Structures are given as C-alpha cells and as structure tokens.
Symmetry: C3
Subunit: 439 residues, 3 copies
C-alpha cells in the first residue's frame, strides 16, 4: 500500500462519530426511539400526590391531586418546543402518532385546567405545575406552549385550547415586563436585562397570534418584528455573526458570552417569524438579513465532530447537544424554505444530524444536553454547566431536527463525492465515488 499501488485519497477516515450517507428511514428510526421514550415519560393523568392512585373524578378532587410525575413536565417551555417539533414531524413523515400525542396532551390539559383552578380557588393551593399554566409569571411559563397550541388549533378547530391560549397570551402581551421601548425584558439578574432566550420565549407566540386573531393580524405582525429588531439591535454582534446571551441596560460595556443554546433560540426565532411573515412584508428584508448573517456566524464554528461548542466561539468549551440539534433544524428548514443554499449548508446540517443521532441512547434519551442555565458575566459559569439526560431541552430539538432532515433528504439528492457529503438538487446518475456533474 503506497502512492503507486493505492488511492491513498480513498482510504477510510477514522471518524469518531458517524459520517456520510443518511437515509430518511434511519432518521425516522431514531426520532421514533426518542418519541417512544418521551411518550411513556409524559403521562397525561391526575393522581393523588401521596399514594399515586389515579384520580378520574375531577369535580370532586382537592389539593391532593397533581399531574402524574414522569421524567418531563407537560407544560414547561421545553415541552412547548417538543409539541411544535411533533406537529412538524407529523407533517414531514405523515406519521399521525406524532400529532395524536400533541392532541392527547393538549386536550388533557384543557380538560383538567378548570378543575385545578377550582381547587386553587377553594383551597388556596394546588399543583405547582398547574399554577404555571393558570398563572404564568414569565415568558418561560407561556410562550413556547402557547405557540404550539395556536399551531395545532389552526389545523383543528375542535381542539379546545382557546381558553389556555387567551390566558397565556394575555400574560405575554399585557403583563410581561418590558423595557421602555416595549422589548420583552426581565429584572433578573439585574434591572432591565434582556435575555437572548426571550426572543424565542416571546416572538413566536406573537407571530402565531397574528394568524389566530384575524382582527389583530397586522398589529401582531408588527409587534413580532419590532421585538425581533429591538432585541437584535442590542444583542447581535456583527463582527462575529453571533448573539450575546445577555444585555443589561445600565452597563456601559456589554460582554458577550455566545452561549450555544440561546444562540439556537435566536436562530429558531428567525425561522418561526419567517414562517409567518408575508413574503412582501416591508420589514422582512431586515429580518432575513439578520437570519442570514447569523447562519454564516454559527456555521463557521461547527466543530470537527459536527457539534457546536457551549460557548460558540470558545473551542475549548464542551460540545453541546441541544444547541446542535436546534441548528440542524434551522439549517435544514432554511434549505427546505429556499432561504439558504443547499450546496453550502446541506452537509453542515447532515453532519450535525450524525452528531446528534450519536447522542440518542438505546433507551431513547438524549445525552450531552446542558441543564437549565441562567445569565453570567464570567466564562467559568458557562463552561461548567452540567449536562444530564433529563435536561428537557434536548428532546424537542432532536425531534424537530429529525423531522426536518427527513424532508430535506426526501427533496434533495445528497451523495458522497470524493469521500465528502455533497448536496445535489437533481439525482446524479452515477455510483462512481468521484464524479463531475453533467451539462
């Protein structure tokens, strides 16, 4: 084996993860494993908190009743993402089990919410999970879930979630704290702080409400855009093509910690907003320009393992799964929508999927996901955020990425060429390992 008798250029590279060909059947097998797992870990039942006995007489129950505790909460913002993912997966795969799940959980929450409200009113206390639904106090308690409920209800008028949607959205649009200019804000950890996460916690709900409330379509399109641009003005870093995680209004400098998951939330927000805006919307160009600039900054920092780093621009920080999945979804979606180039980005998405699929264990858990994480102004905090299989943030994104990869693989015609994944818009009529595209 030498230069004269071997194509050294065709030697099998020693990848640590998987590389190369991907079939939509394999992607579906993997999201089905995650789906089967989360299905059994998100029970839609009321039980006695002391004995675990199933409660079915909701009119009679009291402060002993709670939602059965599986590994993941049904109405956390993390699960808001899962619900949106499964709505999308039903569409790209045609597997109605995915939407049956969302139907079932939403109908269950709609059914029981009023009874728990009555318990709270009579007893002064109830399941803390129900207080999140009934009395949200932050966009984290409302937006992602509200967004998914709007999406499904617009596909099914029989879905009885209007009461929940109105409650959630009344909080978002009328009660949530904002800066003087209206930008969704927090007073933690500092007064008048913007969190990159709130682009995603707040904007998709507003964008979807423009579709749900006919009377307020223009008003909500404009508010969704206004939020987007008021956040991006302050938080985007044009020199890097990345967003800072936080921005404190009083601070005279605004240090950038380009945390991967929140950068995922910003990329996903652009996708959610661009899914709704009319193609001739007058501010669409500015939003699209921001999206495209962010795509370029994020993708340049993909690691050799296909994952992205916890701090995106710090290649000594750990590789994190949930952000990686979010980016894969966004990139596949943007290619599918015609927003970004398939030749340039298809292989990025594909490699990212290989990376993510390698973290779906035999049980269907998603490994390597950063746990719930707030805002810091030092790098040690970010570098050392724990990872755990039970961090709920991994699940939605993996499902959504898989769903979108199936669409991408069913539309495009990727093929290995010279040992590299290449995207082709027409099927190449060759099995040669190295080839030129015909005229």
């Amino acid at each position: 084996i030498n230069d004269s008798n071997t194509p050294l250029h065709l030697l099998q590279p020693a990848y640590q993860g998987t590389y190369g060909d991907l079939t939509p059947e394999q992607v579906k097998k993997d999201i089905d494993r995650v789906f089967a797992y989360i299905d059994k870990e998100t029970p839609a039942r009321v039980v006695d908190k002391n004995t675990g006995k199933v409660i079915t007489d909701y009119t009679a129950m009291g402060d002993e009743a709670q939602l059965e505790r599986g590994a993941f909460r049904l109405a956390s913002y993390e699960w808001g993402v899962t619900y949106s993912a499964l709505i999308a997966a039903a569409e790209t795969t045609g597997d109605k089990r995915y939407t049956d799940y969302v139907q079932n959980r939403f109908r269950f929450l709609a059914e029981v919410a009023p009874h728990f409200k009555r318990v709270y009113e009579e007893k002064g206390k109830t399941d803390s999970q129900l207080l999140q639904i009934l009395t949200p106090h932050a966009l984290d308690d409302a937006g992602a879930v509200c967004t998914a409920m709007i999406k499904l209800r617009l596909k099914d008028e029989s879905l009885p979630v209007d009461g929940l949607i109105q409650n959630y959205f009344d909080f978002i649009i009328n009660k949530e704290y904002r800066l003087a200019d209206g930008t969704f804000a927090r007073n933690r950890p500092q007064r008048n702080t913007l969190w990159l996460d709130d682009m995603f916690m707040g904007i998709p709900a507003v964008a979807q409400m423009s579709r749900y409330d006919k009377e307020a379509k223009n008003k909500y399109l404009a508010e969704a855009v206004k939020q987007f641009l008021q956040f991006a003005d302050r938080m985007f870093i044009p020199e890097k093509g990345l967003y800072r995680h936080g921005w404190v209004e009083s601070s005279t400098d605004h240090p950038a910690f380009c945390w991967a998951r929140a950068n995922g939330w910003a990329l996903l927000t652009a996708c959610e907003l661009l899914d709704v805006l009319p193609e001739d919307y007058p501010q669409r160009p500015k939003v699209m320009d921001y999206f495209r600039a962010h795509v370029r900054g994020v993708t340049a920092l993909q690691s050799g393992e296909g994952f992205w780093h916890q701090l995106l621009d710090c290649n000594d920080s750990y590789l994190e799964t949930s952000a990686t999945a979010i980016y894969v979804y966004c990139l596949a979606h943007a290619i599918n929508k015609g927003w970004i180039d398939a030749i340039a980005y298809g292989p990025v998405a594909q490699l990212g999927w290989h990376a993510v699929a390698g973290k779906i264990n035999e049980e269907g858990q998603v490994e390597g996901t950063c746990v719930g994480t707030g805002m810091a102004f030092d790098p040690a905090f970010y570098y050392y955020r724990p990872v755990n299989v039970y961090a709920a943030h991994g699940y939605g994104p993996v499902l959504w990425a898989g769903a979108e990869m199936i669409r991408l693989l069913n539309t495009q015609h990727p093929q290995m060429n010279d040992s590299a994944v290449q995207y082709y818009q027409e099927k190449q009529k060759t099995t040669a390992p190295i080839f030129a595209v015909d005229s």
Copy 2:
C-alpha cells in the same frame, strides 16, 4: 432525580478551581500567607559573601559585603511592583505591617547605598545588586522601584529616598535610549525596538515624578502621556483590542505575539497613569479610550478556568498566573475608580481572583508564573517559557490584586443569583438563590 422532581438547573457544577462567593477576610488570609512568605525571603541585611556573617559596620566594609541573598532581590523591577502593591494593600486593608515592610526595605537601601558606592569607588567592584541601584542601565533597573519610592515618600517626608529617586529618575529621563520621537526604546534584540514592558518600566515613574517635582508637574504629565500614546500608536492592535509584545522600527510588518504578562504591564500602565492625570487633562480621553478598548479585548479572552493564556489569543497556550493577577488588579481598580462597569466586570475580576488564589500554595509561594522572558518572533518561544515558584513576577501582582479585591468586596455587594456571581451596587435583601432586583 429527573426534570419533574429536580431543579437540574440548580445542580452543583464540577468546577476544577473555586467559584462563587468570596469574602474580604478570605482574600486577606491569602495575601497574608504570601506576605509572610516574602517577608522572610527578602532579608534587609548586609553579610560577608563568603561566610554569611552579618556585617553592621558599614563604614569599614569592603568588597566582601553583599545584600543577604533571600529568594527574591530587593531592588529588581519585580520587587518595585511588590512595593507598590504593599503600599496599596496598607490602604485598602488598614494593615500597617504592609507599609512597615516597604518602609523598612527602603530605609535599609537608603542607608547602605552610599557605603556600597564608597566600596565601589575604592575597590572598583561591589555587589552586583548595588550596581543595579547605583548605576542603572535600563528602565528595568529603575522605573518600578523609583515609582514606589516616590509614592511612599509623598506619604512620608521622613523617608530618606530622595537621593535614590533622583539617581533613578536622572537615568530614566536623561540617559535611557529613545527613538527619534522620544519613545523609550532598546537596541536589543534589534536596533530601535519597542518593548511593551517599557510602557510600565518607564511611564509610571514619569507620572509620579509629576507629583514629586512641583516645578516640573506639567512637563512630566505631558511626557507620560506622550510616551503612552507613542507606544500605543505602534503596539495596540485595534482589531483584537490587545497589544503586541514587540515592535522593531525597521521591520516592514510587525508580527503580534500578545504575551499576557506584557499585556498586563500595558493595562497596569494605563491604571498608573489614570491614577495621576487630572480628570480634565486634555489628552485624558485618548488614554481612557485606549484603556477601555484594552479592557474589552483582554476580558473577552479569559479562560473557563479564570486564568488568561500565555499568548492571550492562543487558547492552546498555557494558563499563566502573573498576568492573571495583574488583570484582576486592573479590573478591580477600574471598577473601584468608576472607569468600567461593575455589573459587567466584577465577576471577571472575582473569577480571576479565585483562579489566582488557587495558585498560592501552603508555603505562600505563587505557582504557575512565567519566568523572565524576552522578545521573539516565533510562537514556540512564548508557548514554552518555563514557570517557576521563584519567578518574582507573581508576588507583587497577587498582593496588589488581593488588596484591590478587598476594596471591591467592601464597596460592592456581589451575590450568587441563578448559580452565577452577580455584582450589585446596593445589598439585595434576599437569600433566595434566584431573584429579581426590586424597583
């Protein structure tokens, strides 16, 4: 332990070093350990170089006499930093032992210098340590020590260091080699070379002399500023917010090796100069702008361990203690002075202190300090500079950083919020792990 039954977001991160709360008492305990150590390793006595017998009849001694050799030289530029550090520490802590040390060493050097001069004149030879004091040949032999002597003498007219100050400063201002435009320069390793280190070796002395010589105040303020800006024009790299270690006038390109300690010296020079300049000094804005830009470039490159890298912009180069300490001092000082934002930078300084305190061993030595280091035009030289507990460069900076951290902690009200260090200007009236700041 899962998403439903655990706050995974409150799990204890597996830090390698310490993180979080810091009390001024702990900082003081640590600088006291360093102080006790250096006190016993910097003897202020004359001994016979052959027998070690203590010499007290200075009028009678000859070329056998030398300063007793402890681990660290009393009048090296490294110890010039230590003296300035201890002057500062006495002020922020109120511990007069720190200034007693400086008083003692300076009075000893003032006392013996004239006798060693007489030995040199009569015998043609004396202790090489005394030749550095009596006949300096480089800013390294004069500036940092002269600066500290001016600082203390202005606080104590009984301190008999005027002869030493005049000798040192005559060298600096009249004998030191300069470029055509007056910028302090060297002819090593190449003709007409600027060393970033000389910002610190030369400028603070000139700035302090403006305070010491009433007649020449304006002249020395102007020269200090002129040096600063003539160095920064050539050596600052605006695209990085960092300084190059060296600049050779003849070279048509000026490669940047952003060596951490010398970048510390440049940051410290800005602090020393800004401590002296009137707030309405006409060139102060340009100096402040340079300082602020350097702060932003340095802080962005802090590692996940709180240390900075030997080459700042090379995250594969070793983490170095002395530079880290210098940055901590500069950042705490700038916050204390109102030059930079506390919310943005307090946690940077605090993490850096945790990092540094972890390198103060039980003996009181400072580990991980880069040894004396000249100028190169290749990266291997910088990457492989040895570290040693006896590198004197670590001591001053750790003491000075600790002193300034005590001030910072006694003024600000930092507190953990959502597992991250946050700086508050008013004490928050809560022990909740996660909280919003009140209106």
Copy 3:
C-alpha cells in the same frame, strides 16, 4: 536555584521538538536523507507488469509494459513539485546530484512516451500512468510537471522535453474547462467550481510558458495574472488573510474551509508568479499585495510546535506536515527575494523547518502528511483526512523548503538572543546570550 542566585530567564525550555540554532549542513543532511530515499523509490525503468522483468526493447513492447512501480509516481502533480524542488536545491547547494535526478527522469519519460503512445494506438490500452502524460484530462495531470520541464529545459537546450511540454500546455491553455470569464474551473464536485489547488496546478505553467515561448511572452504574463486575480477575488478572505479551499459559482454563500495544503498552494503560486513577473509589470502591485496579505494571515496562525493546522484557523485540527513545509519554502524564498522582512519572518521559517525536519524519519520518509483530499462543505471531512508516509505531497515541499533554508542561512546571520531565534543581516560580533545590536 531561586530569584537571587539563578537567571531563571535563561532556564532551558522543555520543547517537544527542536528549537534554536540551525546550520545549513544539518539542513542539507536532512534533505539528502529524503533525496536518497525517493531516488530508490522512483525507478526510471519499463518492466513487464506480470513478471517485473526489465524491458529494454521499447520498439517491440506491447500492453504488458509499464513503468516500474516504486512508492511514488514519476509524473503525478506531487512529483511535479519534487522536480521543481530539486532544480532549486541544485542551485542553492551546488549539489548536481539533484538536477541529475531530474535530468534522468525527464529524459526517460521523453524517451519512452512515444513508444507507449504507439502501444496505445495499436492495442487500445497501455499503462494508466502513461495515459496521464499522453492524454491529460485535468490540470492535476499536467501543470506542475510541465512547469518543472520548462524550468529545466530553459537551463538546458539539450533536454528533449518540448514534445511533452507542448502536449501538456495545449491541454492547459486550450482544453481545460474554465468559467465564462476564463478562470480555470472544474465541474466536480459541483458545476462551475473553483478549487484553490488550481491556482498552483495552472498558473505556474502559464507563467513559465511566457519564458519558453518568446512569441507569446506578453500574452502568457497577462493570462497568468488574470487567473491569479480572478481566483483571488473570489477565494481570498481579507478579514482572515486566508483563502477558502473551494468556491461554487451557484452558491449564494461561500463557506470557508481554510485547508492548509491548498493555502500552501496559493502561497506557492504567488511565489512562482512573482519569480517570473518583471518588477515593473503593471499588475504586479496587486499580486504583491495579495501575497503580502496572505503571508500575514498564515504566519499569525503558526502553532507553538511550528507546524500549521489542517484547517488553519481551527487550532483543534491536526498539525500537518506538507503545508508546513510549503509555508517554510515560501517564507524563506520571500525573505531571500526581498519581498518580506527578515527580522519578522526569519524565525517563523526557521521554527517551521525545525518542525518539518522532526518528521523526516531515519528511512527518509516524511511523516504527518495529509493524503489526497478533495472538497467538502463540512469540517469533519477536513479534520479526519488520513495521514500517510506514502502521501507524495510531503516530499517536494520538504526538499524545496530545505533548499531555500540553506540559501537563507547562507545569506542571513541568525543568532540566539535572550533564548529566542533572531535574524541579523550582518554577523553580530558576540557570543553573549543576550545582546544589543551595535551602532
């Protein structure tokens, strides 16, 4: 051993590879080891492909005849580089063995080519290595070899390579696929793709043909420049000072994978072109500006080990030998030619040579060379390219770098100063470890 009794600043650093002084004799010893090895692995004989029996009656042979297979192919583009390297090495060292080798191989190929053509015409098949020579189909099949043949023939009118040169160049200039604007291009892996490698596969041949065909000098100088600038417009990344490996015309974004070897090919192309252009050529300034900007971008990313990384701007990608060697050649050449500064770059080249020489094993093989590598749009492909001693790409560059380092060391007067390699244009009259340059 402490601060008072030891120059800690003069302690021996624990380098992993070699550092410091380099003699032209040592460099020559190392290239002689590589040369002896490749000499025995590149046999210039025809043999029966079944038995290995040497064939000397070329007029009588048939489709059984092939070039004897040693470890490296005689007319691959990799060996085109080797031939140019050895022409250069003969000049800087005066060792005629180097040019005797090239003479021998070129005369052998000139002698046998017509016989193999006759076999191909009569039998319909022949040695695939001869089909590359006789019927090139890509610049890889022609340019580098053609370039070397022109170079030697212009030094020796008796070298009977005009038929091969005309055949190769007819392909390059008239048959090779180009973009609409004339830029040499490929239709793999995508339609209308530019490969950074083709700067080197195509431009030097065109530049040399301007010297070989008197009638077409102006025409070929202009075409060489036009190619250079049409490639660089699209492929250079001014913000990084680096080139992207690929550029697909249809893509709306052009992702940058700054692959080290192809960046070497672009740097080498500038050297080959600048060797030919008149110093008053009207577009020379634009070419020189591109060269100088690339020098600055490449050199800033040299690792602490002296090697450069497989993806230049990804410090977590492997250190690669062939690119490193190419850069060393380019830098030494540019210093020797007066194009870049010796003080700034001599130590870069010198360290790079130490790095490369450490990969020349006792057998004379070159270790750590990336195998033949095509174009990807994901980083995993690049990060995981295999390395192999039989990758032919290492040999030419090491030889050429060594040859040019000998010239550099025989012209300049480098010397250790303060433990760092420093370049001096006049021999310094001192053996002191640390010194100032005299007035």
